[PDB]
Amino acid sequence: AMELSFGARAELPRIHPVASKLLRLMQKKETNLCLSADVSLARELLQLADALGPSICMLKTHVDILNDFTLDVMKELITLAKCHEFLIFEDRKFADIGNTVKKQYEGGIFKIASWADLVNAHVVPGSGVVKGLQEVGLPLHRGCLLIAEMSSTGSLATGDYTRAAVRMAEEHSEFVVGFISGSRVSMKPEFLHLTPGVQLEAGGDNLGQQYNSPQEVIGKRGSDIIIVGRGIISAADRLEAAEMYRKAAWEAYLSRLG
Amino acid sequence: AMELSFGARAELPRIHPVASKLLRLMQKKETNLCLSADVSLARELLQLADALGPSICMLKTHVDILNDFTLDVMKELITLAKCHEFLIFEDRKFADIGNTVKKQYEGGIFKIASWADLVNAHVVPGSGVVKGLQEVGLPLHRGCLLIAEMSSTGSLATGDYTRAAVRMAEEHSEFVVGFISGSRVSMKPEFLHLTPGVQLEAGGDNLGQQYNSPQEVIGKRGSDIIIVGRGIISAADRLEAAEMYRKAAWEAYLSRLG
């Protein structure tokens, strides 16, 4: 027991391939920053992934908000992910019975599993939601994140709900590689912690979003990666905002490491 | 709460325009059956909507599972919904912060808000999920169903969670027209209750789904509408299957009505 670096956690015996790949590039590029690319145009998604790719360890998408999505766009995006070295995380939020989610994960127009290294899912439906996705994810060598806590005001992902998420992730470690949470929720270093609702300044938006700083999230709460969207995208200089958040989240990591 | 027919509730006080339309056609056509058209081909989706249109009060879709989705398909589905008289419910299960769900509800390739009469949402993110959807749905006279309970084993949608779902619906009655539950969770007659996990049996699938009969859900549990998928879809003759479920659920309703 003791805080292990990202690089050491990447080699843990019970580490998942996807999580190991991420941890390795995080340490290599000194970034634990996940950019939330919430844009409506592919060329916009592709432009941002290329420009900020060197500053991030992951790019989170909402492919269903893209007005001109095509599988050729995802092909191009993967080329950028391979080039700049970052994973692709489709924030799809699987939250239905197992029989429906495996279909939403593999088929349809998006064919998410064909290009998403990671996807997340709400635990509210019971473990069937993980077992259904699994059937599609394991063959494709993918990983899954369980939403244990949420950043929004009024969130019901608390107490027993949060504990249920942890037990579910620890019982499906062959596919679940971590959590979407506001702080460390598992004491097993094989699990990744990704925290959204992050900005340098205090505040939030008028539709429920609440913000905490990188030092608070990574340093005081023990999470691993910060997910930032508007904090970077609405800034006049997006590359400088990216670096600021990268250095913010990385230095907080280093401090907690000792 | 004495037991009122669908035709009476449709003329109720705080009754939302959509809920009113739906209850009126239910009474007219003698059907409180919602078809879960879980198929991957637009051609099959449309053919089922045409043949089963007269037997249903609603058609539930999972557009992200349609391999060949286009807005022209929805255009034709709408023509059918108007012809046979049934609402179109997209089981999108919105479950993110408001700023995000409003984009996923309005834009992307699906532009759900443009053709969906109803959509549902998980309450785990907090009321903010309802607020974002509301900004898009209110002017279009759309409605929202809150997922208070779930049909799958291990569901976390219970106790206080379900209570929180009801409070939220009652706090946004201007847009929230009902619930997705296994039974009556609200005593306010203006609120609809739709129940999935239904088959003439009482059984389940290998991925968490659990089944109960129309008599049990509608009659004993006090729900309004049954959402049936495989119990009809897997049949050789789906129309005969739909008619079977229609009479089952209507008679279950006529029984508690007294």
Ligand SMILES: O=c1[nH]c(=O)n([C@@H]2O[C@H](COP(=O)(O)O)[C@@H](O)[C@H]2O)cc1Br
């Ligand atoms: O609890 C959560 N909070 C979140 O903010 N998110 C996503 O993280 C992103 C945060 O974006 P923001 O612009 O930094 O507020 C956005 O795409 C959300 O949908 C997702 C979950 Br799950």
Ligand SMILES: O=c1[nH]c(=O)n([C@@H]2O[C@H](COP(=O)(O)O)[C@@H](O)[C@H]2O)cc1Br
């Ligand atoms: O709690 C729930 N249970 C459900 O089964 N559903 C949907 O209802 C449908 C039921 O299909 P079935 O084939 O009758 O099991 C299916 O599309 C589900 O995604 C939706 C909710 Br919300």
